[PDB]
Every structure is written in C-alpha cells, then in structure tokens.
Design a protein around this ligand. Structure first.
Ligand SMILES: Clc1cccc(-n2nnnc2NCc2ccccc2Oc2ccccn2)c1Cl
Ligand SMILES: Clc1cccc(-n2nnnc2NCc2ccccc2Oc2ccccn2)c1Cl
Ligand SMILES: Clc1cccc(-n2nnnc2NCc2ccccc2Oc2ccccn2)c1Cl
Ligand SMILES: Nc1nc2c(ncn2[C@@H]2O[C@H](COP(=O)(O)OP(=O)(O)O)[C@@H](O)[C@H]2O)c(=O)[nH]1
Ligand SMILES: Nc1nc2c(ncn2[C@@H]2O[C@H](COP(=O)(O)OP(=O)(O)O)[C@@H](O)[C@H]2O)c(=O)[nH]1
Ligand SMILES: Nc1nc2c(ncn2[C@@H]2O[C@H](COP(=O)(O)OP(=O)(O)O)[C@@H](O)[C@H]2O)c(=O)[nH]1
Ligand SMILES: *[C@@H]1O[C@H](CO)[C@@H](O)[C@H](O)[C@H]1NC(C)=O
Ligand SMILES: *[C@@H]1O[C@H](CO)[C@@H](O)[C@H](O)[C@H]1NC(C)=O
Ligand SMILES: *[C@@H]1O[C@H](CO)[C@@H](O)[C@H](O)[C@H]1NC(C)=O
Ligand SMILES: *[C@@H]1O[C@H](CO)[C@@H](O)[C@H](O)[C@H]1NC(C)=O
Ligand SMILES: *[C@@H]1O[C@H](CO)[C@@H](O)[C@H](O)[C@H]1NC(C)=O
Ligand SMILES: *[C@@H]1O[C@H](CO)[C@@H](O)[C@H](O)[C@H]1NC(C)=O
Ligand code: NA
Ligand SMILES: [Zn+2]
Ligand SMILES: [Zn+2]
Ligand SMILES: [Zn+2]
Ligand SMILES: [Zn+2]
Ligand SMILES: [Zn+2]
Ligand SMILES: [Zn+2]
Lengths: 555, 555, 555
C-alpha cells in the first residue's frame, strides 16, 4: 500500500497543430489576463482598506457691524457674540435673531401669528397646552392690540413666539466671515496618521477648488456660492450646510498619497413645510432676578449650522488579499479550453455537414473537427446483463439490443444501430428450418424455454447464402490448426488431450467469430452468435456429456 | 518553433452511457448552481456596499406645568427651560433638578449624605480634597443641624452635594413631549442622497411601529414604553436612551428602495453602582456679582439624554464584484467529477468484490466500475536500471524485480506479481546443469561475475519440460524466414550478408520472445530472457568474434 | 437524444509509480493546505465582520485650589467651574483663563500685542475690520499706556485680545483630576451589545496599561505621561488629546471575547504656526445690564479637549463567507499538477539530453520523462488539403509537405521531417525515364497538368534499386490472394467478378503500401504513393475504361 502513496496521475492529452485553435486560445488567455490585471489595479484588490478616525478643530474669524433701530443703534458682533463654545464636527454662526427681554411668568395675549387671532372665548380652550405659543390657555379671548385679540395664555410674557424673523437678516456681514478647519485622521490598523495642514503651507490663502484646493480656510459666502446657494436669503431663517472632507489615501511607499478633497452640500431641505420647522434656529435663555422678580431674557437665534463630515479609507498591500483575488480569478483561464472543446464537439455532429454546410459552404473546412472528436473521445456502454450485440452479413452496421427478451426472438427484436469499428490495417496487412431463419442452417435452441429466444438468431435479415458457406469461416473459426496455434501462443506447454481441449477450441472459435464480426472486444464480449455458426462450431468440436451452456454474462 | 505557438492541447476523455452517473452529475450540478445563485441573491454579492454619512436635526415640542412648594408655586417650562441649544446626534430633556442659589466661597458644613456625618475632628482631615463634597476639608467636625454634625469644608456654600433627587420628578409631564427628527444621509461613492421626510407625508402623525412606522415624530413616553422602560422612574435620576435609525438601502433602479427603520435601546446600565454615577445629570452654574460679592447659582439637572444613532449601507451593482464571486464559485462545479471518479476508483478495487459483495449483494451491479477504471487509467512504472520482468511457463502471471542483485540469482529473487496483458485478439485472430535450473537446457552465464546473476534465470520455477521444446518457440523465435521477413518489413532493401544480419536476427529473436511472453512492449523492453532460450537463440545465430553483451538499459 | 442526457465524461489518465513525483505532489498539497488554513484562521475569513455603534458617557472628578493676586485671593474650582455640560464623545477641562469684566461698546486702544503698536495715524486704517483685535479701526493712533500707543478701535472695551496666556497655568491641579468613561457598544447585525464596565469590577482602581488595563478611570496627568507629553506646559495654551477605545471582538461561543483596549494620542500639532491658532481655547461671554449700560464679561478659556474615539469590529461565523473563501482557494490545489507536468514536458525535450546532460550528469536519470511524455501526449496534425506525406526507402524518416504545389514536382519540394511510427510488434510477431526519377520504373503522370506534379514522386532521393524489386512488395501489395482475403474479411460474401473487384483490389494495394511504409493510419490517409509503385499496382489491376482518378482529399 506504500507504493499507493508514491503515485502521480497525469491526464492524457492530444495535440493539434492548428493555427485557428492556438490563435483563439492565446487571444482568450490574453483577454482574461488583461481584464484580471485591470480590475486588480483599478480597484486595488491587492490592498486591505481601513476606515479612518477623525478629529476636527474649527476657528471662525470675523466681526459684524449691525445698525438697527426711534434711534440709530450701531454695534458690532465678535466671535463670542455669534458662535458657541463647540468647535468640533459642527459649528454654528448666528445670522439673525429675535430677542425678548424681561420676561415674567404671568398671563399675556398669545402672539397673533398665522391663524392665532380669536374672535370669541369659544375659540380658546381652557387648560390646553399650545406648543407653538409655549403657554397654557385660559380659555379667554383678550385684546392684543387695537385691532386684534388673541387667546390668553400663562407663559413667559411678553410672548413673541410666531413673530417673523427680521428681513433683511441683521448679521448679513457673516457672508464675509472665514473658518479655519483642522482635520486630524488616523488609520490605526495601518498605524498611519496625518493632518490637513502641513509645514510650508501658505496662511494668507483662501480656498478655491481650482487655485487653492488645499487651503483649509473657507469664506462662508464662497461655500454657499460654490453650490448655487444664496447666503443672504438663508441668513433670514437659517440652514444647515455640510463641508465634506474625503480622504482617498494610498499608504504604499511606491505610490504614497494621502490628501483631502473638500466639497459642500446643503443638508436642510429648502422646501420644508412651515409646520416642520423650516430653517435652523434655537432659543437660548438667560435668567436673572430684578426687583425681586425672577425674569428671563430669551433670544431666538437663526443661523447656519456647518456640519463637517470626514470619511475615507486607507489602503496598504496585503498578501492574503492578493492571494484570494488570484485564486478567485484562476478558473477564468479555462475559458479557452471550454470554448474550443465546445467547437470541437459541436462541429463533430453529423447534422452539421448534411444540413449546415449546403446552406453555408464557408464552414465546410470545419469538418476536421470530426477527426479531433474521434481522436479525443472514446464512448463506452454500461455492461449490464441485457446488453447484446448482433451483426448481419447483409447489413454493414451493428445492432445493439439493451432490453429484456420477453419471449420474442432476438432476430425480431429491434435495436440501436451502431457503426462497425475499423480493424487495424497494420494487423490486417498480413498474409423444417425455423421461421425466423432464412440461411437454411440454423437449428432450434437447446436451452430452457425461459431463455431460448436468446439463441434464436440468424446470420442475416433477408434470405440468402449463409455466412458460414464462405471459406473464411472455416479458415478462421473451424480451422483446428489455427485454434491450437492460438492456444499454444497463450499456453505454450498445453496438452492436447481430453474434452477440455475440445471445450477450449469451441470457446476460441466463438471468440474468433465475435472478433471477426464485431472487431471491438467490448462489443465482442457481449456479442451473440448466430444459431447456424454456433451449432456448426459445436458439431466441429462436440461436447460428449451435457448440453451446451451458452452465453454467460461477463460480470 | 513558431508552430509551437499554434498548438492546442485537449484532454482525452472516455464516455459512459450510464443513467446513474449522468443523473448524479446533473443533480450535483443543479445543487451547486442553486446554492450559488441563492447566496448571490440573498447576500447581494453582485453589489458594492458603501456606508452612509448622516446629519441629524431635532426639534422638541412641549410645555410642562410644575407645582412646587410654605406657599404654592405654579410655573411652566418651555423648550428654552429644559433643552440645550444642541440639536444634533444627541439632545437632552431635563426631567428633574436641584437648585442652589446665592453660593459664596466660604466655609460651610459638608452636606450629611450617606456616611458623611462625623463625630470628632479626628474623622475630618485637614487639607483633603473631597470630590464628592467638592470642597477642601479643614479637619474640623462642625454642626450641620440640631442633630447632625459634619466636616467643615471650603467650597461654594451652602453645599447641597449628595442631596437626593426629588421624588417624584418635578418635570414628569416630559413623558408627553414630542421630538421631530430629521435625518439626511448620503452615499458619496454612489452619489445618492435622501432624507427621512418626503413630500406628502402627514404632519399630525405620531410614530407607531405598526400604524405609523415612518412618522419621524416621537412621543418620549412611547419611546420608553416600546421597550419596557418606565419614564416616571427614570425621570428621577435620569438616563440615556438610544434612537437607532437603520438604512438598508438598495440603489438599483429595478429594485430601488431606501427607507429608515426606527428602533430604541436604553444605553445606561439600570443596575449601576451608586459609586459609578447612576443615571444622568450635569451641573450648570451661572455667576453674578450681588452686594459686591461674587456669587454662583448652581442647578443639578437630571434628565434623559437621547442619542440618535444612524447606521447602514447602500448597495449598487458592480461588475467586478460579480466577476469575483463567479470566479470564487466556479471550482465548485467539479464536485460531480470528483464524486463520480471517486466512486469509479473505489469500486474498481478487488476487495470490493471478494468481501463487500458477499455481505451485501445489492452492490453487486457496481462491479461495472472495474471496466470503467481499466478504460480510464493506464498504469506505468518508472523505468530505472534495476527494473526487470520475468515470466515462468508454469505460472500464469508476470514477476517484476525492482532491486539490485547482490550476487543472488534472479531465479531466487522475489518479485511483485503483475498480470499478463491480453494480446489483441484481432492481431492474434490470424493463421551438470546449474542448480537454479530445472529445464535441463540452461547454461552458466558468460558475463563478468559482478553481473552474472542477471542471466542466471530459468524458464520455470518447478521441474518440467522446457518452454523451448514447444514448436511455437521455433516458429516464432528460431524461424529464420520469419525474422528475415520482419527485418525486410522494416528495411525493404536489406542486404542478407555478413555478421550484422546475424546480430539483427538474434536481436529480433530476443524481441519476439519478449513480446510473446510479456505482450506489453513496456514490459518487453525490461524483460529478461531465460538462459536456455538465450543460448539456444545464440547457437542458432552465432557470434563469430567476442562474447555476447547481454541486456542493456534502454535509458 | 434522451441518452445524450445520461452521459458522464471522465478524463483518461496515466499512472506513474514514481517516488519523486508523488513526494513532490504531496509536499505541494500540504503546503497549499497549510497556507490556506493559516490564512483562514489568522484573518478569520470564515467570519462576517460588522462595525460597532457606540455611546460614551463621561464624568470628571476633582477640585482645584487657585491662589492668585495687591492681595492674596484664594479660591477653588469644582466641576461646574471648569467643565461644560457636554459629557459625550468629547469633554473639556479648563486649565487656564483670561477674564475681561465689564466690557462696553465704545472706542478703546487696540491691545499692544506682537506688531500692533502704531507710530502715526497713517499706520491705522479707517473702517478696517481687524479679526485679531475684534474691532473696527477709526484710523487714529492713540496712546495705550505711558510708553506705547495703538490704533483706536470700536469694540467691546477694554480689549485684551492678544494678551499672553498666564504662565504658569492657574489650573495646574487639573493634572490630578480623574475621568470615568462609560462606553456602550452594539453590533446590530449580530444582535450583540456590551459595555466597558461589568459587575464585580473594582471602583478604587486607576488605569494602568500593565496593572489595571481595564479600569475606565483615568488620571489626566497619567494620560499625558503615558505618551511623553507634559501636562504642565500644555495647560498654558491648551491642546486636544485623544482617548482611543478599540474593540476587537469575537462573538463565536467557542471563542467568545469582547473587551476594550485603551490608548492615547495627541491630536493637536505641537509645532503649529502662531498664525494658525496654536493650542485650544474658546471665548465665552455673559451679558448683563448694569447702571443702565449693557455690559459683557468675557472669559478666554484655555484647556484640553479630550476626544474619545471608539472603533472596532465584531466577527461571527458565516457559512457563505467560508464557502466563498474555500472556492477562492480551491484552484491553488492544481499547483502540483502544473509543476510536475511542466517538469515532464520540459525534460522530454531532445535538447535536454544532447546539451544539458553532458554539462551536468546529475540530471541524467531525468530522461525517463521522455517515456512519460510519449505515454501522455498524442500529437496530431490538422487535416487540410495540402497535407501530404512521403517516404523514401533510402531514408529512415518520413517527410511531410504542407504547402501548395506550384508546378514544382513533389520530389523536389522540401518537407518537415517526422519520425516513422513503430509497428505493433505483437501484430508483427507473426509468420527516357523522368529526370526526377532514379529507380528506372516511374512513368509520367496521366492527370491534367494543373495537378500532375502530385504524382511526380519517386521511391528514393538517390539512385539505386527500386523498392518494388523486393519480394515484400509482391507479397503485401501485389498478392492477389492476400487482397481477396482482406476483402473477404471485411465482406465475407463478396462476389469476385466485374471491374469493381479490380478497383477494390487496386485500392487495397494502395492502402497496403501506405500502411506498410507510413504505419500510422493518420499518415497513411494523406500519404502519396511513388509513381513506380502506383503504376505497377495499376498494371497488376488494370482499369478497362477511363484514366485513374488519383489521390482524393478525405475531407
Ligand atoms: Cl446663537 C448665540 C451664540 C453666542 C452668543 C449668543 N448670545 N446670547 N446672549 N447674547 C448673545 N449675543 C449678543 C447679542 C445678540 C443679540 C442681540 C444683542 C446682543 O448683544 C450685543 C450688544 C452689542 C453688540 C453685540 N451684541 C447667541 Cl444668541
Ligand atoms: Cl438642563 C437645562 C437646560 C436649559 C436651561 C436650564 N436652566 N439653567 N438655568 N435655569 C434653567 N431652567 C429654568 C429653571 C430650572 C430650574 C428651576 C427654575 C427654573 O426657572 C424657571 C422659573 C419659572 C418657570 C420655569 N423655570 C437647564 Cl438647568
Ligand atoms: Cl471653560 C468654562 C467651563 C465652565 C464654566 C466656565 N465659567 N464661565 N464663567 N465663569 C466660569 N468659571 C468660574 C471662573 C472662571 C474664571 C475666573 C473666575 C471664575 O469664578 C470663580 C470664582 C471663585 C472660584 C472659582 N471660580 C468656563 Cl470659562
Ligand atoms: N459472446 C458470445 N459468447 C458465447 C456465445 N455462446 C457461448 N459463448 C461463450 O462460450 C462459453 C460457453 O460455451 P459452451 O460450449 O456453450 O459451454 P459448455 O457447456 O462448457 O460446452 C461461455 O463462457 C460463453 O461466454 C455467444 O453467442 N456469444
Ligand atoms: N529484453 C531483453 N533484451 C536483451 C536480453 N538479452 C539481450 N538483449 C538485447 O540484445 C542486445 C544484445 O544482444 P547480444 O547478442 O547479447 O549482443 P552482441 O554482443 O552484439 O551479440 C541488447 O541491445 C539487449 O537490449 C534479454 O534477456 N532481455
Ligand atoms: N493515400 C493515397 N491514396 C491514393 C493514392 N492514389 C490513389 N489513392 C486512392 O485510391 C482511390 C483512387 O484510385 P484510382 O485507381 O486512381 O481510382 P479509379 O479511377 O476509380 O480507378 C482514391 O480513393 C484515393 O484515395 C496515393 O498515392 N495515396
Ligand atoms: C463682503 O465684503 C465685500 C468687500 O469688502 C463688501 O463689498 C460686501 O459688502 C461685504 N458683504 C456684506 C454682506 O457686508
Ligand atoms: C439673495 O437673497 C437676497 C434676499 O432675499 C436677495 O435680495 C437677492 O436678490 C438674492 N440673490 C439672488 C441671486 O437670488
Ligand atoms: C400625558 O397626557 C395625558 C393625556 O393628556 C394625561 O392624562 C397624562 O396625565 C399626561 N402625563 C403627565 C405625566 O402629565
Ligand atoms: C413607574 O415609576 C413610578 C415611580 O416610581 C411608579 O409610581 C409607577 O408605579 C411605575 N410603574 C410601573 C409600571 O412600574
Ligand atoms: C498632584 O497630586 C500630588 C499628590 O497629592 C501632589 O504632590 C502634586 O503637587 C499634585 N499636582 C498639582 C499640580 O497640584
Ligand atoms: C513641563 O512644563 C513645565 C512648564 O513649562 C516645566 O516647568 C517643566 O520643567 C516641564 N517638564 C518637563 C519634563 O519638560
Ligand atoms: Na477556482
Ligand atoms: Zn439461419
Ligand atoms: Zn446462417
Ligand atoms: Zn533451465
Ligand atoms: Zn528452459
Ligand atoms: Zn522512380
Ligand atoms: Zn521506384
């Protein structure tokens, strides 16, 4: 069994000197290789990709001059006046405000915003909380001014909720403010970190997608203008703007590159329903005790929230990824074999000559695929007991019968026609009768009736001379000298005495007939001799005791 | 060499008409195809997936009525009173508070919380910072009330740290508050963006996992109740709640779909140790100068922080992903071949007939695999110098010797038994002696002693008649006419003169014996002639000058 | 066609008893298997990986004692005095501050920071906004102190912008503060959630990478010291520090593990340009009305922003991932076949014996690959009309001509030399003349001139005796008895009358010569008979009417 370990199996192959097939093979191989390499390079499937972790630090610069009114009030706003302490992934710049000073808890008329003007105390509801007004209704319609009256609410008073944002925006100058963004990223798996500002960078730059695509200083109005948004209009009610920072980073030494790409995107819907809080604002309150009364000053601050969104991946060569990709793509290199074998097996079909070629004679030279097919494939048949082969001297083909004989004579049974194999020319280049019978020599079978129909076969389908009348039958089958010579060839020291030699000669005659007619040993093994030939052989080599056994299943 | 380019190699194959094998093959092919397709469709391995980038904007609605006590104090809380300006990925709603007004830097008794009541100045430590009390101890135990005394600390005074949160929570009405969540997402690789609110959506809706699973307006109490949490109890000390927004988005036109799925999850541990800050609170201070004294008002605000967590992927068809998947799965289509070849090579074994079949005769019909194996495999042996083949007329098999001869005669040397090949019946269907010897005809070798044992072989293992006594030996081996005919067949214009013709006839006789006995040319090449036959041949075709060279290694 | 369904094709293979090839095959198989398994286990390519979603809750503990100056002012700072309400992914600890109390809108001298000292009103610019000073210049150079004068600005006054941060930092004690971090993560795809604090954990612990690598309580100074950063110096101007929490989590039951790894990283550049806002600070304003004047108190707060960065993946077994990996790696198991077949086809080359072996005789035993190659490959040639084979009795090889004959005689045409196939020894082990001619027997062709050169071939290249003079030619080719015997073998009941039998005998003689000389039937089919032999055959079997057709293309 140890030799069973030291075995190598290699496939048998046939080789063709064909220009067409070799050319097609190499073309397909090159195509597969080119696509595989292109995909590998384009998608960098040799790399392991890791997402980044980011930190953002922002700084806003700018002073706004605000002139508002009775009297002309001039003032300015600095960063502490329009920005919040947060300086990370988001920052807020106030662009407009409404302020209510000295609020007190008490009853006051609800502000007459859209559809808040009541006509009778029936319209008002006692105890009902109005989230819009931010107070509790007392169910009384009371005057708000000379020509309007509204529901009385308990709230911080005076209540200006629902008041329209001032137009134009008070902090319009914010269009001209600048923000510096510092972005630190890291790929912890690859142990790589970098930042968006490097030594030698200019500090007086201002971002431009063309001239200065790497300056991290942005004018807000320019941010809006780059994407077709009007800062002046958004400043009235506010909005949300995104600054996207994309890092497509290659961390391989021979191709190292990691720099940010900046882009902008509005994040609030422009056509938001008035009931879904259009824009962006928040209310900030300060609380103080004055005159023994606890009071509140509220500012409703409209502005733009800038969301800084940082995303990306870092790639570095990984051998396991490349190995997996190559394995995934290796099987595509059998395309040439699949296609050319398909061509060979398709043009080897007979129908491709009888029908296709007459219509199109350009494909006539493609008949050589029959030769390739016969040199490539060896068809064989499952050797099961009902398998039988018969040959008729009148006909040139062989007939295969692969069904049980339900009493019907094998002569009458139909069968699948198959070609007669060609005998090797090298080896050849040497020196009252039964109704089913018509050769005048067959005899009734001598087996049990259950299996008598097997031996009820003749040498031909039509009346004529028996095959055994030929001298070849006696030369090959009944020539005792030839059979003894064959047996001696197999058993040099054979003893020619007894009935055993007679049986051996009878079997050799059966084999000789079967090999002469069916040629192939696979067919010869399952062949069936005609009754005439069988009984002639048996008469030439009689069996003293017992009746003849007949054909036996080799398996 | 150019013709070497234009070559196509195709594998030689044998074909079997078998119902069982074809059925198994197609079943396995269909199984592999079905699993591959199912996996591709289920996991959408034809798609490239990209993670989303998100922006969240929240708005809380609701007014709380608070009645607290000496006197009955009625007041209300609006959004500016219980929410912070931040409206992004997280928002905070105050549900309870403790307020300390008019704090001053001075010495005060430490608040008598759990285990903070001292009995003597020894318990207190001078200069020690207590993070719980948030002051510096002076090492003196001083009275706090009539019946308790605590360590004196320098801190903002009066100090109420450690005071229990009021129960029930003052802002319980917050259960009935609502929040509107607006979520904007983008897949920048796929250049796709959408939002969680679309035109035509109802505004008076309230979220429900069944009735309104797409309304982005949520009642906080409902959020808690959906996951078995009690808002009333959490409101006392606070907590953290997660609102998860999942985007499983398909961006293919024929299957386009991108909508959010909402879900809730508590993020703070319910059974947190009292020493690990259970709940959620923060302390907010306002500073003011009154009476020339700089004072502080501190509010300890308990509440629920809502964390909005947005995650998901967007898939779109990619040809390279599909190609990689198909390549990864192509090799699974050789399963049918592997399994059926395994069956053929396993049932071709001899042991599978001698032992297995008697126990189970259902497997008797599976002996046909021997035929398939012999039609599929051609075993060959490495042709190395020690390779030899011998045949004995008494025995029916061949004996292979593959070891060096250490003086021992080849007759005595043991060998591996191998079958005698079958001669093509088509070609056959034609017209004082040494101790190791027992045929009475062998002679001692005439080589040098170092290699004499090679030629010390007989024609049989047991006493009997020599093979050469048969007429076949003279007909085939010693028939000068036959050998001349063979030589002329190979060399039509051969000259029959000199000793060269004698040598050629001797070699042809050796070849004829080797082909007759061993049949196969692979075995014939490495065969060894018996001494009797060899010396008989040499006598029939004597060599005038020199001793005979003997067997030569073909390689 | 139904039988076409029930077919199984298996490859024909040859088997070699070789120790070297089997050993190499098993070594390569084991190598491929070992690498595949190692990669699968190391990279856990059987797992589907999901990114986590995180929530962070922080709590800072500590009290700072600050003694600052005229008079000695002693005070303390608690969490509400140096922390902001936010307690999520980032938190801020104030380490230094500059405070400006009682600011008013009015004109004031610009603070004399680096290069802000003007000498004349020309240096100042009217109406220019200075983001550094945060005011509007009036274009007047006015005194700031006794020995310096600066540009007058309208701003919040007094303006201290540009003033140096105090050194040493006032809140140095913050080195000794602690922060507790609570981190909740979830893998929603795998439906797994955990947290960084579990029951039974010690509460008095403090983080250490060696002793306490799992305590989520961190001293800030220790955070800095672990990565070689000086808290004392960073406290003056501030900075940003990252606390990274990595979750490498395996969610398989047999290998379950999910715990955090903590690490630190400075996120602000240490060598930042003074014009790019080095450090970290923000300005916070409180607004109040005093004496009827609206005033502002501004604090410029320097400190450390701590960014808590949480990242990681969770893996769980997926069958589809494993199936894809196995399919991707299956094709690597053909390496043994590729390599050994390459060896066989490379050492089967002739040049590898004539040249390589003499230089290196260690490779002499590798000549056995010629036997393997001839037992493995069957070369065949495309059967196209110009294909011809010729043989010359003087020469021992065959000559293939694969080009059109442009009138030149086939005798003169050159051709590709090919070996003569070996005849099966088993079958063999039996009983005025044209200028191009030199055998004295050839005759001019009798075809049309367009195709006469095909038949203008002789039996030899050099003068000598004709092949047909041999008795073998008459025995094999002209033996009428042998040809009739062959025809009867193929057609047992053949009728020997008419000219049809003569034509059959002529064709059989052509076939016999072609098989005798070219041996292979593939070459015999396209062989060309010499004129001498052809005309001798035709004379022996004359054609009564019509001229002889000649060679015909089989396809
Ligand atoms: Cl969004 C935001 C961010 C940061 C701070 C604030 N707050 N909070 N309280 N006040 C402000 N800003 C200042 C201010 C706002 C409106 C009206 C008057 C006013 O005072 C003056 C007086 C003179 C010149 C300039 N401003 C806000 Cl609302
Ligand atoms: Cl968490 C948070 C978010 C947003 C704001 C605050 N702040 N900061 N300072 N005050 C508040 N809210 C108001 C307030 C809280 C407690 C007690 C009294 C009180 O005032 C009144 C008086 C009458 C009616 C209602 N409230 C906080 Cl603590
Ligand atoms: Cl960053 C930040 C976070 C949180 C709060 C604040 N604010 N905002 N306003 N004041 C503070 N802190 C308090 C304070 C800061 C500087 C000087 C004096 C001072 O008051 C006293 C008085 C006695 C003892 C201690 N402090 C800031 Cl600046
Ligand atoms: N192929 C084939 N073999 C046959 C046929 N008849 C007999 N045999 C073989 O010949 C043997 C039986 O010969 P037979 O003389 O009838 O048996 P006997 O009773 O021992 O004399 C069996 O092994 C059969 O395989 C036949 O028609 N075709
Ligand atoms: N297979 C085989 N070949 C043999 C044997 N003896 C001789 N030969 C072959 O015959 C040739 C030598 O014949 P021999 O008459 O001894 O050589 P001589 O000295 O030239 O006459 C060699 O090429 C051998 O391959 C044998 O026993 N077996
Ligand atoms: N291979 C080969 N075949 C030949 C040659 N000459 C004739 N044939 C074959 O012999 C047949 C023609 O024989 P021929 O006597 O000339 O034809 P006829 O006119 O019917 O008598 C054709 O089918 C040819 O394939 C030859 O030189 N080589
Ligand atoms: C922005 O700056 C330009 C140039 O100084 C000025 O013309 C423009 O009016 C400014 N915009 C606003 C809104 O003040
Ligand atoms: C931008 O908005 C402002 C305010 O409504 C308006 O005056 C101005 O014309 C707008 N500009 C454009 C280009 O729409
Ligand atoms: C919530 O609203 C319902 C219906 O108005 C009311 O019955 C309930 O008391 C409210 N909850 C609280 C805590 O006020
Ligand atoms: C919820 O908590 C409150 C406060 O402790 C309690 O009164 C109420 O019974 C609780 N409800 C449930 C269902 O546990
Ligand atoms: C930190 O604490 C240690 C031990 O109490 C003390 O020696 C050191 O001075 C403290 N650091 C500062 C900056 O106060
Ligand atoms: C840390 O910084 C402080 C402030 O500059 C300095 O006094 C101290 O020597 C520094 N320590 C080290 C180790 O550099
Ligand atoms: Na594969
Ligand atoms: Zn008959
Ligand atoms: Zn008959
Ligand atoms: Zn002997
Ligand atoms: Zn003998
Ligand atoms: Zn000639
Ligand atoms: Zn000739």
């Amino acid at each position: 069994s140890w030799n069973d370990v030291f075995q190598y199996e290699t496939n048998k192959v046939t080789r063709i000197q064909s220009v067409n097939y070799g050319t097609i093979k190499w073309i397909l191989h090159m195509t597969v290789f080119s696509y595989v390499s292109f995909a590998l390079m384009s998608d960098k499937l040799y790399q392991r990709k890791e997402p980044l972790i980011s930190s953002v630090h922002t700084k806003v610069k700018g002073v706004a001059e605000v002139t508002e009114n009775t009297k002309l009030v001039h003032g300015i706003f600095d960063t502490a006046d329009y920005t919040l302490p947060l300086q990370g992934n988001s920052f807020f710049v106030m662009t407009n405000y409404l302020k209510s000073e000295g609020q007190e808890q008490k009853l006051c008329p609800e502000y007459p915003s859209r559809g808040k003007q009541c006509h009778s105390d029936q319209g008002c509801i006692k105890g009902w909380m109005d989230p819009q007004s931010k107070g509790i209704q007392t169910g009384r319609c009371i005057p708000y001014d000379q020509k309007r009256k509204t529901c009385e609410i308990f709230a911080w008073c005076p209540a200006e909720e629902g008041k329209e944002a001032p137009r134009p925006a008070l902090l319009r100058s914010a269009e001209n403010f600048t923000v510096l963004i510092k972005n630190n990223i890291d790929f912890p798996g690859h142990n790589y970190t970098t930042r968006n500002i490097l030594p030698g960078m200019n500090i007086s730059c201002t971002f431009h997608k063309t001239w200065n695509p790497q300056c991290p200083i942005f004018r807000l109005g320019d941010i809006f203008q780059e994407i077709g948004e009007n800062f002046t209009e958004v400043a009235v009610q506010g909005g949300i703007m995104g600054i996207e920072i994309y890092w497509d980073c290659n961390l391989d030494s021979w191709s190292h590159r990691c720099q940010p790409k900046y882009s902008f995107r509005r994040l609030d819907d422009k056509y938001t329903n008035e009931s879904l809080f259009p824009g962006y604002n928040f209310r900030y309150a300060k609380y103080y005790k004055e005159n023994g009364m606890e009071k509140r000053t509220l500012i409703k601050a409209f502005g733009v929230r800038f969301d800084i969104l940082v995303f990306g991946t870092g790639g570095k060569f990984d051998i396991i990824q490349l190995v997996v990709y190559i394995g995934s793509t290796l099987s595509y290199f059998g395309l040439a074999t699949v296609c050319i074998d398909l061509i060979i097996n398709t043009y080897a079909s007979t129908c491709c000559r009888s029908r296709v070629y007459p219509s199109c004679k350009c494909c006539e030279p493609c008949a050589v695929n029959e030769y390739y097919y016969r040199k490539k494939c060896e068809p064989i048949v499952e050797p099961k007991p009902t398998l039988k082969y018969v040959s008729f001297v009148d006909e040139p083909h062989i007939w295969m019968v692969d069904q049980q004989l339900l009493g019907k004579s094998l002569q009458d049974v139909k069968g699948q026609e198959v070609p007669r194999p060609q005998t090797d020319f090298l080896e050849l280049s040497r020196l009252d009768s039964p109704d089913w019978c018509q050769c005048g020599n067959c005899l009734p079978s001598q087996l049990p009736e259950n299996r008598r129909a097997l031996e009820e076969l003749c040498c031909r389908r039509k009346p004529g001379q028996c095959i055994t009348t030929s001298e070849l039958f006696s030369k090959i089958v009944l020539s005792r000298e030839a059979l003894q010579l064959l047996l001696l060839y197999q058993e040099p020291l054979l003893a020619l005495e007894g009935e055993a030699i007679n049986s051996k000669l009878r079997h050799c005659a059966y084999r000789s007939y079967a090999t002469w007619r069916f040629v192939s040993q696979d067919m010869a093994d399952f062949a069936i001799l005609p009754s005439c030939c069988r009984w002639k052989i048996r008469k030439e080599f009689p069996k003293t005791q017992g009746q003849y056994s007949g054909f036996k299943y080799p398996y």
